[PDB]
Amino acid sequence: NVYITKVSAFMPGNPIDNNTMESVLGFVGGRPSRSRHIVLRNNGIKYRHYALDPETGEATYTSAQLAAEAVKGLVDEHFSLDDMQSLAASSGTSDQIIPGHGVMVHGELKNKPCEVISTSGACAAGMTAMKYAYLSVLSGATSNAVSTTSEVPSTVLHARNFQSENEARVAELERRPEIAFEKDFLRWMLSDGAGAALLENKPRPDGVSLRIDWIDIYSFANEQETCMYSGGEKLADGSLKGWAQMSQADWLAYSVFCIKQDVRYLNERVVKFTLTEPLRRIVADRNLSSESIDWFLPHYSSEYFRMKFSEGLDDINFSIEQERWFTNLTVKGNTGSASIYIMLDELMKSGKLKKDQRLLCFIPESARFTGAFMHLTVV
């Protein structure tokens, strides 16, 4: 058996409300975003955090530093950093391409030499890191394991990531160039945060531990196109052209390293190919009952999709009523891969969990349509 015995969340700086967030992320071409208003109206997020200094605008934490803060939050009398037998770390916004994120987090933590692995991707990468840690303990390879994820998309959403594209279109004499909606959209969706979990082969003697019953993950990339992407451009045939296949000049003129979202494709396919297609396989294969679930922990990212996902549950005959849904999206921000840790941290410290309650965690990844699901039991 494997038990989550400690969770930790780390949000950089103070919550930033809707009227302040654009001043933090800057103007492109000296002009404010035309779509920020409606993007915010649709997603419903009221506060979020950025690893950006409120006065100077300097970065306050690298991605590696942010993960390290979340990991340090696991330390108590029962666990010190030198106790960890394996560290699995992810970040969709790693500070560098090489080395991997995890060894940079190890460099920040400076705990004694141990196994460090990094997983990659977007929102689901936090769950593939957790599943690595889970399999390590479940197989007996270790007695404990730590997984952690961090997101600092502020680094790439800041207006400066579009300056050379603006200047390029100004040199094409274009009058009022605006970056594409595909490029501006995520600036008002994604924000900064980090989480960590300690997994052990025994529950704590005191207090609650969440037994991991299984973690099931499905990719639908075999038939779905790339939908969220950075360091590349999506072509007309739906394929993704990687950055090193484009001229250096084109990296700057087209903001190739910014995060982009194929929003119409997202809208059309996210519910089916991150929720209903994987969950119906999981329900049937594990003989699941919608009513056995006391807590549904969905990372639905945007108020716009909350009831769309809920209708997906209905369509596969797995309805879960809103009274059993737990999230803090509106107040914490969409922290991507860190969202499920930020949700678990709050629920677990809240005092609302009771022994034998069953939790279903749902982590979609629109990058190329992965659905990650985790079933927990309170002990």
Site for a copy of itself in 298-317 (CB under 8 A): none
Q: What are phi and psi of 175, to 5 degrees?
A: -75, -70
Q: Fill in the per-residue mask, 228 to 247: x = in contact with a copy of itself (CB under 8 A), - = not in contact.
A: xxxxx-------x-xxxx-x
Q: Are 172 and 364 in contact (CB under 8 A)?
A: no
Residue 28 in contact with a copy of itself, rule: CB under 8 A: no
The total of other beta-carbon atoms located within 10 Å of residue 35's CB is: 14
Q: Fill in the per-residue mask, 152 to 181: x = in contact with a copy of itself (CB under 8 A), - = not in contact.
A: ---xx---xx-xx-----------------
- Find the binder of a copy of itself among 75, 159, 177, 221 (CB under 8 A): 221
Token pair, residue 58, equals 């300097």
Q: Fill in the per-residue mask, 32 to 61: x = in contact with a copy of itself (CB under 8 A), - = not in contact.
A: ---------------------------x--
The Cα–Cα gap between 112 and 321 comes to 46
Q: Are 60 and 88 in contact (CB under 8 A)?
A: no
Q: What minimum distance in Å lies between the beta carbon of 233 and a copy of itself? A: 9
Taking CA atoms, 312 is separated from 111, 208, 271, 276, 362, in Å, by 44, 32, 6, 6, 13
- Find the binder of a copy of itself among 77, 223, 285, 356 (CB under 8 A): 223
Question: Exposed/middle/buried for 168, CB within 10 Å: 0-12, 13-18, 19+?
Answer: middle
Residue 251 in contact with a copy of itself, rule: CB under 8 A: yes
Residue 131 in contact with a copy of itself, rule: CB under 8 A: yes
Residue 19 in contact with a copy of itself, rule: CB under 8 A: no
The letter for the amino acid at 150 is S
Residue 113 in contact with a copy of itself, rule: CB under 8 A: yes
Residue 6 in contact with a copy of itself, rule: CB under 8 A: no
Token pair, residue 2, equals 């494997």
Residue 101 in contact with a copy of itself, rule: CB under 8 A: yes
Residue 139 in contact with a copy of itself, rule: CB under 8 A: yes
Q: Which 262-281 residues touch a copy of itself, going by CB under 8 A? A: 277-278, 281
- Find the binder of a copy of itself among 119, 144, 274, 310 (CB under 8 A): 119
Token pair, residue 184, equals 């501006």
Q: What minimum distance in Å lies between the beta carbon of 201 and a copy of itself? A: 12
Q: What minimum distance in Å lies between the beta carbon of 265 and a copy of itself? A: 13
The Cα–Cα gap between 8 and 81 comes to 14
Taking CA atoms, 240 is separated from 63, 200, 246, 320, in Å, by 25, 40, 12, 36
The Cα–Cα gap between 318 and 307 comes to 14
Q: What minimum distance in Å lies between the beta carbon of 209 and a copy of itself? A: 19
